[PDB]
Every structure is written in C-alpha cells, then in structure tokens.
Amino acid sequence: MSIKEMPFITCDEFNGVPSYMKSRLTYNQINDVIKEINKAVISKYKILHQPSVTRNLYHRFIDEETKDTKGRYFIVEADIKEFTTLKADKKFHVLLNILRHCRRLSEVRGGGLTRYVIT
C-alpha cells in the first residue's frame, strides 16, 4: 500500500525561508526532521492498514479523526515520541514553523487537540 510522504525541502526553498526562521537550523537538520516525521506517518498508517499495544494505538488514531481531518494523512505530537528519536520539544516547534511556511503540513485543531496534516 502507498502512503503519502512529506518531501524534503529544497535548497532554494531553504534559501527563501525568512532568515529568522532559519536561525540555528542548517539545511540538513530540517530534512533530518522531515525524515523522522515521514517515519512517524508511515508507522501510523501501516498500523491502520494492519489486520496488541499496537492495537490501542489504532483506537487512539480513530478517536483523533475529525470532520476536518477527512480522509487525510496526519499525526499528532505524541506520534513523534512514539515512533521516532525526535523530541516534540522547542526546536521541533521552530522546525514546525518552517515546515508550515513551506506548505509541507498544516495544523488542525479541535477537541482540544492539535493534529499535523501532511500537505
């Protein structure tokens, strides 16, 4: 089964990112983080497309689905911690600002929960 993935940002894209957003981040660090996010997305949808601790993950996934979330691909901050070596902390969030800026993902909120939908 095919699963949507977020592409690396390009150098020109990186170059165009407003300097302040970039700050500490190098080009490679950003795409390093994209790599981990895709890993989190992949892992989630394999589970969804799967026929036991993994299976209470499945229900949390269902539970998070929204009118606005549709048949779209998404993850939430807990997914990072669950599937990757990334920490969903402060730098992850600076990074998020870049990912959003480059239209790589969007933030969906509702039910007191922030979902990250793959653009």
Residue numbers in the entry: 1 to 51, 57 to 124
From the paper:
Originally discovered in a proteomics screen, the Ska complex is now recognized as a key element required for maintaining stable KT–MT attachments. The ternary Ska complex, composed of Ska1, Ska2 and Ska3, localizes to the outer KT in a KMN-dependent manner. These observations suggest that Ska1133–255 (from now on referred to as MTBD) is the major MT-binding element within the Ska complex, which, on dimerization, can bind MTs more efficiently. Here we have used biochemical and high-resolution structural analysis to show that the human Ska complex interacts with MTs through the C-terminal domain of Ska1, which forms a variant form of winged-helix domain.
To understand the structural basis for the ability of human Ska complex to bind MTs, we obtained crystals of the Ska1–MTBD in two different crystal forms that diffracted X-rays to about 2 Å. Models from crystal form I (space group C2221) and II (space group P32) were refined to 2.1 and 2.3 Å with R factors of 19.6 and 22.5, and Rfree factors of 25.1 and 26.8, respectively, and superpose well with an overall root mean square deviation of 0.6 Å. Residues 133–142 are stabilized in an extended conformation, followed by eight α-helical segments (α1–α8) and a C-terminal β-hairpin. The structural analysis showed that the Ska1–MTBD is related to a winged-helix domain, a domain known for its ability to bind DNA and in mediating protein–protein interactions. The Ska1–MTBD differs from the canonical winged-helix domain by the incorporation of two additional modules. Analysis of the electrostatic surface potential revealed the existence of contiguous positively charged patches all over the Ska1–MTBD surface, suggesting the potential involvement of multiple MT contact sites. Confirming this notion, a combination of R236/245A with R155A resulted in stronger reduction in MT binding than R236/245A alone, and the simultaneous mutation of multiple clusters (K183/184/203/206/217/223/226/227/R236/245A) almost completely abolished MT binding. These results provide clear evidence that the human Ska complex binds MTs through a multipartite binding mode of Ska1–MTBD. Remarkably, the tubulin contact sites are dispersed across the surface of the Ska1–MTBD and distances between different contact sites range between 15 and 30 Å.
